[PDB]
């Protein structure tokens, strides 16, 4: 599908409400494979399961491993802003 | 297969 940008919003006291799976190590993007109801993710309303992500604040993620991910993501705060896309 | 986390 159409690559998208997506705005997220998030306090201190949460996660970004999403499970990601995937990464370069096995060959395949960053993936959402879970929104977890009424977290930010699932409040945002444009992220949703199978969404690769492409980048997070202009942070690339297409050639991050797993963790590098993990860290990268689990680092933002407040407005995030998402490049995601579905195929 | 691939790792899965929750953030």
Do not use: M
């Not at chain 1, 395949?28 to 492409?54: K, N």
């Amino acid at each position: 599908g159409p690559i998208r940008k997506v705005l997220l919003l998030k306090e201190d006291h949460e996660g970004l409400g999403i499970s990601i799976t995937g990464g370069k190590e096995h060959g395949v993007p960053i993936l959402i494979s879970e929104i977890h109801p009424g977290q930010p993710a699932d409040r945002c309303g444009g992220l949703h399961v199978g969404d690769a992500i492409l980048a997070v604040n202009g942070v690339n993620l297409r050639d991050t491993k797993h963790k590098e991910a993990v860290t990268i993501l689990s680092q933002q705060r407040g407005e995030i802003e998402f490049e995601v896309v579905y195929v | 297969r691939w790792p899965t986390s929750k953030i």
